[PDB]
Amino acid sequence: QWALEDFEIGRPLGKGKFGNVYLAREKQSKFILALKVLFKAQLEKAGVEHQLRREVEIQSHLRHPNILRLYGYFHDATRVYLILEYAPLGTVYRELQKLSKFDEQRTATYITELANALSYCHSKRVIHRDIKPENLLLGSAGELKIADFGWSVHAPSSRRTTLAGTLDYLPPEMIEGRMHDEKVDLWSLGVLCYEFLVGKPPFEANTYQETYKRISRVEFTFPDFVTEGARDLISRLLKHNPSQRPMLREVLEHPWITANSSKPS
Numbered sequence: 001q002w003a004l005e006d007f008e009i010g011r012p013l014g015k016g017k018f019g020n021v022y023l024a025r026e027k028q029s030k031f032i033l034a035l036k037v038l039f040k041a042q043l044e045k046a047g048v049e050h051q052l053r054r055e056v057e058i059q060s061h062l063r064h065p066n067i068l069r070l071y072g073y074f075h076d077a078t079r080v081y082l083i084l085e086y087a088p089l090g091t092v093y094r095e096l097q098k099l100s101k102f103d104e105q106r107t108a109t110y111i112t113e114l115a116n117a118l119s120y121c122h123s124k125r126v127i128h129r130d131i132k133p134e135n136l137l138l139g140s141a142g143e144l145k146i147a148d149f150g151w152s153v154h155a156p157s158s159r160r161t162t163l164a165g166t167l168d169y170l171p172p173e174m175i176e177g178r179m180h181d182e183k184v185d186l187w188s189l190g191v192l193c194y195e196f197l198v199g200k201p202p203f204e205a206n207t208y209q210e211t212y213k214r215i216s217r218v219e220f221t222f223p224d225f226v227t228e229g230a231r232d233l234i235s236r237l238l239k240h241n242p243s244q245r246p247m248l249r250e251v252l253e254h255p256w257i258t259a260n261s262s263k264p265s
């Protein structure tokens, strides 16, 4: 079906571990999209074919306004190409670098959009597991979109794959390699809410080793400017025991969320 010669390639949109992502236009229709390019050699050396397969399977069948579409894929002798919905306003990661911290209204609005998307996923027992600002994209109206489903799975689950870079968004049971479920994404939601308001993640440290210790002991503190309501929500999400973390419905109905968010459920 699709091949490289069907597209004109444009500027680089971003780079991940495996993904080299470019703007592109389909020649016959003039349809603008994002082409995520992957090198078969690297996919093989790291043995993550199964993650590539998860990404395509999951993200092509999901349909939600806060989840990035994957339209299809093709490959040649050396590369795999994923055909993605283009997100024109970039990453939440980039927006945070620009603004330093987000106000309560912006933050609550992003958390609602996240909770809506995750509620859709969890209803199929799909868990994302890699929710962080570089994987959160922005639509033409500034709406948040979850992307990069390569680490996703069906719960419950173990971990058969070596962890990559930062531990900053992972809960104790994932880093300790224990069994885990949907509640992992709730922990990550708590980390994100804190980082949006404060400008950095709550367990950040100088070394992998120290970050690990801070996560497993749940050692975090708040700057004076974080309000009582935000503190309440964040403290409920960052519980060591996953069974004690709230349901997404409880997040969406939290008074600090309903008081400050621009969007509904």
Ligand SMILES: Nc1ncnc2c1ncn2[C@@H]1O[C@H](COP(=O)(O)OP(=O)(O)O)[C@@H](O)[C@H]1O
Pocket (backbone or CB within 6 Å): 013, 014, 015, 016, 017, 018, 019, 020, 021, 034, 036, 068, 084, 085, 086, 087, 088, 090, 091, 134, 135, 137, 147, 148, 150
């Ligand atoms: N659809 C898209 N629209 C705009 N930018 C994108 C899109 N997809 C990815 N990017 C940019 O490319 C980066 C890497 O993409 P990602 O799919 O997260 O790669 P990896 O799987 O290697 O982490 C993202 O962090 C983002 O900056």
Ligand SMILES: CCOC(=O)C[C@@H]1C(=O)NCCN1Cc1ccc(C)cc1
Pocket (backbone or CB within 6 Å): 040, 041, 043, 044, 049, 052, 053, 056, 073, 074, 075, 080
């Ligand atoms: C849906 C998962 O796969 C594809 O996206 C494309 C295509 C296919 O249809 N099945 C699997 C082999 N092939 C891709 C491939 C990827 C990586 C390496 C190292 C070799 C081959």
Ligand SMILES: [Cl-]
Pocket (backbone or CB within 6 Å): 157, 158, 159
């Ligand atoms: Cl497993």
Ligand SMILES: [Cl-]
Pocket (backbone or CB within 6 Å): 158, 159, 160, 161
């Ligand atoms: Cl795994």
Ligand SMILES: [Cl-]
Pocket (backbone or CB within 6 Å): 119, 247, 248, 249, 250
């Ligand atoms: Cl729920």
Ligand SMILES: [Mg+2]
Pocket (backbone or CB within 6 Å): 016, 134, 135, 148
């Ligand atoms: Mg990524």
Ligand SMILES: [Mg+2]
Pocket (backbone or CB within 6 Å): 016, 018, 019, 148, 150, 151
């Ligand atoms: Mg990936």
